[PDB]
Each structure stands twice: as structure tokens, then as C-alpha cells.
Design a protein around this ligand. Structure first.
Ligand SMILES: C[S@@+](CC[C@H](N)C(=O)[O-])C[C@H]1O[C@@H](n2cnc3c(N)ncnc32)[C@H](O)[C@@H]1O
Length: 221
């Protein structure tokens, strides 16, 4: 049906109705034991989420009109370069700093310039990344998404219309994000990437699944 309904349903299942965050945690714990048992990794640091709050902190980037704000149990901060509705904060995400030690966005001259680090259970890039000028700026957005996420939070990535998705999967794994869902909807590909319990775990996964010819960034032809 709709990417919006698809994403609300996934988020709800991931944190509430299906505990997918706990399922993937187990998969990642087993993967780490496998790697340690092969001497390829040592004593890495792991960071886990507490039980989800009743109200999830969701950052909707390139939101346009804040579709997610009325979804139950989502507390949505919506940003857009050119907001269409008054409830979307103006921001060029490429110029946003991710700042530890703050609780809410800070604005200068009416533009979001700073967001709280490690604060959001969910970051949503719905048909946003194809607006970036370069491949390296698409990666930059996902790197900011990673500093914004709580441990085991999820990046919801929706892009318009296989080896390229394997490349994005590899590129995002290099920076700590492991894909946990991929679904094809009419005219779009719907993906969710999870902030792994350990970035080093994610990077080693990517090392193993690197095919020859693929870049470190995330590309749009
Ligand atoms: C195709 S619309 C998608 C709107 C909504 N997310 C959806 O799924 O329908 C792309 C949006 O990204 C916004 N955008 C483009 N570059 C941006 C940037 N650098 N920072 C914040 N928003 C940006 C545009 O203003 C536009 O609202």
C-alpha cells in the first residue's frame, strides 16, 4: 500500500508488538560469538537499548508535511529544507550538527542547526537521499543518522526505483548499520537499518560480505 503505513507498522512491530529489536539482538550476539571463535574479533564494546518507552522519539528528515506525527506512540521531530506545513522545522540536514548533552533541537535564525546525539529510537529518510548532490553526501546523512540513533535504533530508508542494494547494505554496514528488513512496494524500495549492538561487529560483517567493485559510499546512478 503506502510507504507511510508500511513504516508505521514496521516501527510498531520492531519496538512493541513483535520485539524485533530483541530478535536481532540475539542474531547479533550469536554472530559476535562466531567471529570471536574465529579470532577475527576480540573484546568489543556492546551497547543495548532499554525497553522502549511508551512514546518513541522519531526524527523525520525531508519530512515535507509531517505524515508520521499522528501515528500512535510516535513523538516526531520533523525537518525539511522547504517545509510545506507549519509543524515541520526548517533545516538543511547536511548542515546539522549532532550534539551530545542536549535534549531538543536548537535553532538559529529559524533553522535547525543542532540535534541531540543518541536520542532517537527511529530516523526516517523517506524519499530523501536521491535529493543529495553526491554519493558522499548520501553517506554523510546516514552517518548523522547513526549518531542520532539510540543503540539498537533503526534507520528507515525509502528510495524510488539489486547489486546497488547490496552495495548500500555493505556501505551502511561499514558505518555500523545492519539491514534488518527490505520490502518492495509499488515504485519504491522500503528498507530498515539497525544500529548494531557493536559498530566493530557491523564493520567486520561488511568486511566478510564485500564484493569486488563496490564503493564505500552509497550511490544513485
Ligand atoms: C520527495 S520529497 C519526500 C517527502 C516525504 N518524506 C515523503 O515520503 O513523501 C523529498 C523531501 O526532502 C526534502 N529535502 C531535500 N533536501 C533536503 C535537505 N538537504 N535537508 C532537509 N530536507 C531536504 C525536500 O524539501 C522534500 O521535502
Amino acid at each position: 500500500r503506502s510507504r507511510i503505513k508500511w513504516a508505521i507498522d514496521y516501527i510498531t512491530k520492531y519496538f512493541f508488538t513483535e520485539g524485533i529489536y530483541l530478535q536481532k539482538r540475539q542474531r547479533e550476539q550469536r554472530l559476535l560469538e562466531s567471529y570471536r571463535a574465529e579470532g577475527k574479533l576480540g573484546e568489543v564494546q556492546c551497547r543495548l537499548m532499554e525497553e522502549p518507552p511508551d512514546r518513541l522519539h522519531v526524527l523525520d528528515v525531508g519530512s515535507c508535511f509531517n505524515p508520521f506525527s499522528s501515528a500512535p506512540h510516535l513523538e516526531v521531530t520533523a525537518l525539511d529544507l522547504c517545509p510545506a506545513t507549519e509543524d515541520v522545522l526548517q533545516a538543511d540536514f547536511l548542515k546539522v550538527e549532532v550534539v551530545p548533552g542536549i535534549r531538543e533541537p536548537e535553532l538559529e535564525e529559524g533553522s535547525v542547526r543542532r540535534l541531540p546525539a543518541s536520542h532517537y529510537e527511529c530516523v526516517i529518510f523517506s524519499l530523501l537521499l536521491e535529493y543529495m548532490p553526491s554519493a558522499e553526501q548520501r553517506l554523510q546523512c546516514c552517518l548523522q543518522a547513526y549518531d542520532l540513533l539510540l543503540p539498537e535504533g533503526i534507520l528507515v530508508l525509502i528510495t524510488p526505483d539489486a547489486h546497488l542494494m547490496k552495495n548500500w547494505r555493505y556501505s551502511l554496514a561499514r558505518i555500523g548499520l545492519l539491514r534488518v528488513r527490505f520490502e518492495k512496494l509499488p515504485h519504491i524500495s522500503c528498507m530498515v537499518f539497525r544500529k548494531a549492538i557493536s559498530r566493530e561487529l557491523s564493520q567486520h560483517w561488511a568486511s566478510i560480505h564485500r564484493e569486488e567493485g563496490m564503493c564505500e559510499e552509497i550511490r544513485i546512478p
